[PDB]
Amino acid sequence: NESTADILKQLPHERLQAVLEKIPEEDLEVRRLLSILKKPEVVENEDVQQRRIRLAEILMVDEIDLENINN
Amino acid sequence: LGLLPKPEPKVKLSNMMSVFENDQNITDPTAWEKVVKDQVDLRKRKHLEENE
Amino acid sequence: KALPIPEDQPKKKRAGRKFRKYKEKFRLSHVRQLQNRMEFGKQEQTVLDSYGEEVGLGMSNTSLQQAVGATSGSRRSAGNQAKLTKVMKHRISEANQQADEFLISLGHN
Amino acid sequence: SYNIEDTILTLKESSIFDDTDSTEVLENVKAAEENADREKLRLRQMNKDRRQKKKILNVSSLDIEEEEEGLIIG
Amino acid sequence: SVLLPQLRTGWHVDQAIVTETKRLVVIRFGRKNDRQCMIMDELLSSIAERVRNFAVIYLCDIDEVSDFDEMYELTDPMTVMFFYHNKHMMCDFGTGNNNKLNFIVDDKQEMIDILETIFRGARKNKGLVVSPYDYNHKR
Amino acid sequence: DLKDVYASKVRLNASEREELALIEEAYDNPHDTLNRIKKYLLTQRVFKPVDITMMENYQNISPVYSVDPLEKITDAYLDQYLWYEADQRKLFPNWIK
Amino acid sequence: SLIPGNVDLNKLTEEREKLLQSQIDENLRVNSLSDATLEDLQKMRTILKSYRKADPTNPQGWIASARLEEKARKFSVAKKIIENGCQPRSSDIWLENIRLHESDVHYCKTLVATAI
Amino acid sequence: SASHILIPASDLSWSKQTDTGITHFRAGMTHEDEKLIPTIFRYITTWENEFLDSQRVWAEYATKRQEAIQQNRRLAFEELEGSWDRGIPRISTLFQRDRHTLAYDRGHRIRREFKQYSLERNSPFWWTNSHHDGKLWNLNAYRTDVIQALGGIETILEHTLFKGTGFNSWEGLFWEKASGFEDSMQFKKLTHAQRTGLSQIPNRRFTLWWSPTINRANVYVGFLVQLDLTGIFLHGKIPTLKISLIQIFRAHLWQKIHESIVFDICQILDGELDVLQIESVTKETVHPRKSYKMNSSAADITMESVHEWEVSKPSLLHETNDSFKGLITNKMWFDVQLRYGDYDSHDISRYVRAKFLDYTTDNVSMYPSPTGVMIGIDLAYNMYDAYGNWFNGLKPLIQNSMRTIMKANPALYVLRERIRKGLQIYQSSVQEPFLNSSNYAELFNNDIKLFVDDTNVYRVTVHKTFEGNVATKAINGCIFTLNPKTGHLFLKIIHTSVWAGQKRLSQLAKWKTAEEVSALVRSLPKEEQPKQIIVTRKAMLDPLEVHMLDFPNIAIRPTELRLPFSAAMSIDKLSDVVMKATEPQMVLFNIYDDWLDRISSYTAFSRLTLLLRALKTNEESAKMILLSDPTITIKSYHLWPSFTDEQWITIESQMRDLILTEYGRKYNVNISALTQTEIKDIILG
RNA sequence: AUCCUUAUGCACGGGAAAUACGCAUAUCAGUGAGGAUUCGUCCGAGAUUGUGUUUUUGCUGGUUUAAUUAUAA
């Protein structure tokens, strides 16, 4: 059972999708973590879901810690 | 990995003739027509359902 | 840079509507295959090339069509027709569109 | 004018120039494909039996030769 | 010439043959002063980078190592030889001697084709390979 | 006269196939290629480089010039035109052989 | 399309200048082939011989074996065949025989009078 | 050739085997000027004769043109059909169809001289445009003179493996060119070495074809080497032919041939024990290397007698005079010796008598008695003979048997194919691709197509009465042609009166149908004209081409599938239209009623395949599937009754049931065991 | 509330190409790359360098005979 969920976990899409659910969902809270992290508050056209995914991605690339440690 | 079902070939009214993988292609002509058409209508249904 | 390795690799196959349309460029079509057949015992049809060197088309014309000399239309494959590269296709169209405004400038003047 | 047999009979397939001047036959449509499918079937079951059971046939000269062996006014 | 390494003892030759499983071992037996030995050294020196995957080329001197002279019957200023899994390979070049090699090859591509064909036939255990080019006008 | 080079060939190199596309579109769009040629005549003064090879006759090694096929179309048309009008107007006397 | 035997200039020009003129209005045998081999033409002779022996009547065959061998060979052969199978009601063997076999006035009249 | 080269008298010798015997031909005993290979110096006319002919030819043309307009007429070809090839501009150029646009081409003689600098091809003709000047030479006669100089086709084929290919006549045969063969291999991705390795294949075919001459004692001298398990000798190294002969004999094939013919003569004699009064027939044990060993040999089959035999003088099969009073001895033996012959000696007679005497007189050989029969066979030239000790009822047996033995045996049949794969010589009748099960899905592409089936053209109905027999009446036939897409029919109804005054009614049918198809296609505009015309009968391929020469774009196919259109006369409206027609006519139909409004044409055609295939079988009991519900009404318009969709969905299953039950019932095959592609194969044909 | 414009995301349906699509702890580049001209000027984002694959990427389909048992003695 191990090598089944290990390859599944090693994959970048799943690795991001696991981080996506643990970031809170609101406009101002998503926005506040971005503003504190110095990344762009808003981009041209995005629904707040897509902004949340930009949270996940930006956390993934830099390998920065969770919003727990961020704040 | 086996977690997701193997995809079946997309069949259109053009491609309808040349897909022999399914049972009913030549031997039952009309039920195969119904199968194909309902596959198409089903995909368009998925599109509209997603939009709504 | 190094040659990769001579080791042969196991052949992989697919035949689609898309990919047969791709390899239609890369295969000898039916009519083109009939040039490659030499009928045993008698001379070919050969037609003078622009340089004058006889170009044999052996079986491409039915045994009756040599007598009448009507050649054939037969079945022309439209898939191996020559087509432009991405660089050349926009250069042609561009040249023509600017030639158009040129012909208009000469049209009103 | 030569026949093979409320039934209808049609011309059997024959080559133009190979036929030339020769006797022509009249056979039934269902009877022609009937006989052909009986013989070729007998060949198919013997194919599956030969290849499956791995038996080698006696055959040779007389057998293969005999395999080469295989009027109305209106 | 400087591109290719040289083998200064018989044990560097032998181990060079033994330690290499997956690609051909090509040795030029000859001396630096000879005329024909430097030419195949240049030819093989250009080819070494292309072929490093499926073959490797080494250099051996007869005066430096005289031990193999009688065993493989080394005459003429140079002999190129081909080894796969300690097995001396063999190919009929038309020169009448299916063993080793003698003459100076002309074009890079013709020698790369010899290496490629000897290799491919060597993977199948095939002892004799047939070159695409019979040069016997040379020998 | 640009086309007949390729009639004896069963296979096509990459460039020859491009040139066949050029001739074929030149047939399919004759008005458009007439306009394009005429504007090249009035206008274009700058051209893409010509590439040299050399034929060996084993005695005389002669230059061989390969131009770009768009330019080859205008050159072919202009050539055919100049010769038709030039002989139609009786330009060259009897002694140009 | 590069099979070389097909190209002839007339059909390409009248096929072309009409497409040119249409676009403008919208804006507003080869000598090269070897002659037929006697044995191929002989195959033609056997098939057509079977087809003329098929129908003694139905002059369409006689005219066909005449004009095909005409395009192939002609000279004596066709001119003899036509006169052979022309032996009466159908006017077409006469319209053909007249056109091909005449070449001189008196014999023209001789064929015309028989057709009359 | 430009050179003096003679054919020596030894090259012309050629032999041919017929069922009467083996005949030889040698032209060398005639002593005259020795036969020479022609050179071009005969076949090219001097410049003088060509120009001196040019003035007079153009003069004659001017005069004839004046005589034509003088009569208010235009030049007839027959006038100039005397001289075409004569004169330098080549009068034929006057009658070219493209001349009208060649007049605007000027300066070409200079263009060709300047094609040197635009492109890299050597142009051995820079001085001629065959368009302007014409074809200024014909070498065609050089060829026939080369063929006759070498003695004809036959004396050439004695220099080849042709007789090994097993073909009786060379007529229907063709070569697969190695030029194009080299092209199809370069569309794969290959290394330069893989590339050069494929250019030696055509040389390799050439070396096979001429092998019996290239391999002989006189050409290479040298010393014989023996191919390991065969009886083939190589005089020179010849690296290619060694490889090719090795690939011709695979898996101990030489031995399979010898064992094979021995099995054959066994099974022919063993049943004849009675007639010839033979107590036993014993094929002996075989040292496994005996077949291909040459120097020594030992008897194979042994034969015993009820009392004794009356031997004769040792002689050959095809000889006539026999005297059996020579001896009386006991028992017999047979050798069968395969030989792979050179062109030096292909004669089996001398070989069989020499080996016979040598072995029978050899001390090292082993034979049961001193009475026996040697049977030699050349596998390269497909020849045979026997030098026997003969008894009553052998030569009339051994001859008739060997006739079948050479043309039957699977071993030989395997030689002949392994060879003709190496030569890539093929037989063909129709070059066009047939309809297959795998080819079926192409019918539905955008090319307009037609189906033409003549099986109903001439028909006779036998009826049962009480008194005499076989009531027979001629009936109106029909030519049945449909296009599958639009579902549109063309029926030419052939009346009985058309058959009144002719005999040999078979060929008239196929030719009439060819004519009617020509008229039908010409009726249609170039918009509606088909591309592939598809015909079931193969005998209709030639008579259509004759009439279709005017339409070169249309292609004609036969089929391996039997299409169920002969049963089309079981439809009632159609057959009623055919029975009541008093004249040849043309009636349009839509078989699909309206199936195309609700349903695409593919499944509309594939349901028609079912409807018709079942009508070939159970007929009216396949009609009781249709006519079950009288509330379902055939209109005056349609043929088939109007249903909903699901009603068809059930009916198609019921129709498939008749097919699948009667196919098995007739052929004693169980329905359930059938694979899906076997069911679709049963439905199509 | 309806209607419309632009840009972006997802997508049903319809085409075209794979000498084509990419990659770079690498050099420059609206602080001007690369071109055009009718000689007045005009257009305005890639160019170099190395490299991966490229008659091809993944996946599939076809073809190459159960048990049981009955006589009058």
CSV table of C-alpha atoms in Angstrom, one decimal, chain D:
chain,number,residue,atom,x,y,z
D,1,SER,CA,-27.7,-24.2,-71.9
D,2,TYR,CA,-26.0,-26.7,-69.5
D,3,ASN,CA,-27.6,-26.9,-66.1
D,4,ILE,CA,-26.4,-27.8,-62.6
D,5,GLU,CA,-29.1,-28.8,-60.0
D,6,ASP,CA,-40.1,-22.6,-58.6
D,7,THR,CA,-36.3,-22.2,-58.5
D,8,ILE,CA,-34.2,-19.5,-60.3
D,9,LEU,CA,-30.8,-20.2,-62.0
D,10,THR,CA,-28.2,-17.6,-62.8
D,11,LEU,CA,-24.9,-17.6,-64.8
D,12,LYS,CA,-21.8,-18.9,-63.1
D,13,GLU,CA,-18.7,-16.7,-63.0
D,14,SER,CA,-16.4,-17.2,-66.0
D,15,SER,CA,-13.6,-15.3,-67.6
D,16,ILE,CA,-14.2,-13.7,-70.9
D,17,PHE,CA,-11.1,-14.6,-72.9
D,18,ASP,CA,-10.4,-17.8,-70.9
D,19,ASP,CA,-14.0,-18.9,-71.5
D,20,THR,CA,-13.9,-17.9,-75.2
D,21,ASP,CA,-15.9,-20.8,-76.9
D,22,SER,CA,-16.8,-23.2,-74.1
D,23,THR,CA,-19.8,-24.7,-72.5
D,24,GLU,CA,-21.6,-22.4,-70.0
D,25,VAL,CA,-23.4,-23.6,-66.9
D,26,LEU,CA,-26.5,-22.5,-64.9
D,27,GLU,CA,-26.2,-22.8,-61.1
D,28,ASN,CA,-28.3,-21.6,-58.2
D,29,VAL,CA,-27.0,-18.6,-56.2
D,30,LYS,CA,-27.5,-20.3,-52.9
D,31,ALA,CA,-26.1,-23.6,-54.2
D,32,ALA,CA,-22.8,-22.1,-55.4
D,33,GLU,CA,-22.0,-20.4,-52.1
D,34,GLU,CA,-23.5,-23.4,-50.4
D,35,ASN,CA,-21.0,-25.8,-52.0
D,36,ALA,CA,-18.1,-23.4,-51.7
D,37,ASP,CA,-18.8,-22.8,-48.0
D,38,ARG,CA,-19.1,-26.5,-47.3
D,39,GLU,CA,-15.7,-27.3,-48.9
D,40,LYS,CA,-13.9,-24.3,-47.4
D,41,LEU,CA,-15.5,-25.0,-44.1
D,42,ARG,CA,-14.2,-28.6,-44.3
D,43,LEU,CA,-10.9,-27.0,-44.9
D,44,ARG,CA,-11.2,-24.7,-41.9
D,45,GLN,CA,-12.1,-27.3,-39.3
D,46,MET,CA,-9.2,-29.4,-40.7
D,47,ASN,CA,-7.0,-26.3,-40.3
D,48,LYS,CA,-7.9,-25.9,-36.6
D,49,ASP,CA,-7.5,-29.7,-36.1
D,50,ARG,CA,-4.2,-29.8,-37.9
D,51,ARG,CA,-2.6,-26.8,-36.2
D,52,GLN,CA,-4.1,-27.5,-32.8
D,53,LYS,CA,-3.5,-31.2,-32.6
D,54,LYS,CA,-0.2,-30.9,-34.4
D,55,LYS,CA,-0.9,-33.8,-36.8
D,56,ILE,CA,1.1,-34.3,-40.1
D,57,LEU,CA,-1.0,-35.2,-43.1
D,58,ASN,CA,-0.3,-38.2,-45.4
D,59,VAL,CA,-1.4,-36.3,-48.6
D,60,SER,CA,1.3,-36.0,-51.3
D,61,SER,CA,0.8,-36.9,-54.9
D,62,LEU,CA,-2.6,-38.6,-55.4
D,63,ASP,CA,-4.3,-36.7,-52.5
D,64,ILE,CA,-3.2,-33.2,-53.7
D,65,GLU,CA,-4.0,-34.2,-57.3
D,66,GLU,CA,-7.6,-35.3,-56.3
D,67,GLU,CA,-7.8,-31.9,-54.5
D,68,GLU,CA,-6.9,-30.3,-57.8
D,69,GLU,CA,-9.9,-32.3,-59.2
D,70,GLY,CA,-12.1,-30.2,-56.8
D,71,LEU,CA,-28.9,-29.6,-70.5
D,72,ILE,CA,-32.0,-27.4,-70.6
D,73,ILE,CA,-33.9,-25.8,-73.5
D,74,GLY,CA,-35.3,-22.3,-72.8
